From a paper:
Although most signal via cyclic oligoadenylate, an alternative class of signalling molecule SAM-AMP, formed by conjugating ATP and S-adenosylmethionine, was described recently. SAM-AMP activates a trans-membrane effector of the CorA magnesium transporter family to provide anti-phage defence. SAM-AMP lyase exhibits a typical trimeric PII-like protein architecture characterized by a triangular core formed by the four-stranded antiparallel β-sheet of each subunit.
Crystals of the E71Q variant, targeting a key predicted active site residue, were soaked with SAM-AMP prior to vitrification and data collected to 1.65 Å resolution. Although SAM-AMP lyase E71Q variant crystals were soaked with SAM-AMP, the product following cleavage, MTA-AMP, was observed in the maximum likelihood/σA weighted Fobs–Fcalc electron density map at 3σ, indicating turnover had occurred. MTA-AMP binds at the interface between two monomers in the trimeric complex. Several residues on the T-loop (comprising residues 59–71) and B-loop (comprising residues 106–111) of SAM-AMP lyase constitute the binding site for MTA-AMP. The adenine base of AMP is stabilized by π-stacking interactions with the side chains of W64 and F84. T110 and Y122 form hydrogen bonds with the bridging phosphate moiety and the adenine base of MTA interacts with T112 and S50. The crystal structure of MTA-AMP bound in SAM-AMP lyase confirms the predicted 3′–5′ phosphodiester bond between the SAM and AMP moieties formed by Cas10. MTA-AMP is buried in a ‘slot-like’, predominantly electronegative, cleft between the subunits of SAM-AMP lyase, with the predicted position of the carboxyl group in the substrate SAM-AMP orientated towards the B-loop.
Residue numbers in the entry:
A (entry chain D): -4 to 124
B (entry chain A), C (entry chain E): 2 to 124
The structure:
């Protein structure tokens, strides 16, 4: 037996530095667990208030910019977080978007970052059960 | 002209495959995708290539998520007009592959997204 | 308040550079991007930063793909209105850098995609 839902929706992408100066991780595996733990805590706290849980897929990365602006040679250690508003769990896309933005700001604070990006992209989600 | 890209997220089912690292689980999914993409190409003459990335997916521990996230793989690809003449048939093929990956990886659930994109291909 | 993001996928040419791990190949591509982006900024006043991710790309072994996939790097970035005034010129700059990366990495083929996105920038 099987079920499939298709619909138009939004995905998000967030990019954050990982302040090695403060957290002292030794590998991309370790920094992935660091950010995963922080996200898990803040997402749970928000869900308990609003009944909106924002799950995130987290990927290891480095971000390259001008060394004159503080970038290490070959790039700064970063993590990329992405997720989609699944109609199985989301009834109001505007409130979901507001929740993502709030979580992005909290992550910026917890990771002690000067700057952070949060993007929304239109997507067609097929969800299989 | 516009085309489509796809993105799939899958678990790696340590209970069934018993991988010991993110490197090993990346190669596992790579090999499975290679087999199922070839099998579909033999039927339809459409080959769907995939870029695969290591990841962890974070959700509520009450729903079965490990502490700090579940080991996952992200697969993405694009409909390249060099190889694709019919976008509808390509889309149908991706959906078939997404279902087959869900089956082969023994996953309860699976996401497959389509996004509009403008592809520049340099050869 | 829409802008564009880009995605590039490149091989890492073990035949030429002889890297021994995904960590080493990530630093290789990062260093090359850093140099070419700086050079272009000095000419055009457009700096294209990139997020770089480790990956493998899976295609038919009959076409040269290793078993379980080819080692690749994925580069993404977004046109931030804080720094960019003209989206057409930014896109032209990305395309030039994508071609230069193809040349420096000695790749036969390369993809560069553009996707519409809504950027929130927090400072
Ligand atoms: C790697 S798959 C594992 C879980 O990983 C998350 N996940 C999977 N793919 C994605 C994706 N592309 N982007 C973001 N998160 C994703 C999802 O939370 C997914 O949960 P399932 O869809 O499998 O739901 C299983 C059950 O868990 C509950 N649940 C899961 N997510 C939510 C949620 N967001 N809100 C409420 N309930 C939720 C609900 O009972 C549901 O039937
Ligand atoms: C990392 S580059 C390596 C290969 O990796 C795959 N690839 C590269 N970039 C991407 C990307 N963004 N998303 C998904 N797959 C990608 C492609 O399959 C690519 O093949 P090439 O474009 O280099 O074609 C090489 C030759 O191989 C054949 N070929 C490659 N792909 C297909 C195809 N899909 N259908 C038919 N023939 C195909 C054909 O002879 C072609 O001239
Ligand atoms: C991991 S955050 C680190 C740096 O990483 C880059 N970065 C962050 N998120 C992303 C992303 N999603 N995609 C691509 N690059 C990104 C950005 O270059 C960022 O720079 P900041 O926004 O923090 O600016 C810091 C300062 O650096 C200068 N600056 C940074 N980027 C540019 C730029 N593109 N052009 C000119 N000046 C730039 C400017 O003075 C600014 O006040």
């Amino acid at each position: 037996n099987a079920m499939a839902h298709m619909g138009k929706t939004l995905r998000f992408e967030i990019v954050s530095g990982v302040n090695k100066g403060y957290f002292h991780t030794n590998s991309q595996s370790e920094s992935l667990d660091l950010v995963g733990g922080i996200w898990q805590k803040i997402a749970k706290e928000e869900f308990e208030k609003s009944n909106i849980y924002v799950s995130a897929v987290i990927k290891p990365s480095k971000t390259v910019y001008n060394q004159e602006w503080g970038c290490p040679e070959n790039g700064q250690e970063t993590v990329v977080l992405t997720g989609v508003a699944n109609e199985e769990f989301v009834d109001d896309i505007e409130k979901w978007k507001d929740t993502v933005i709030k979580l992005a700001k909290e992550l910026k604070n917890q990771m002690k970052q000067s700057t952070l990006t949060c993007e929304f992209i239109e997507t067609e989600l097929h969800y299989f059960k």
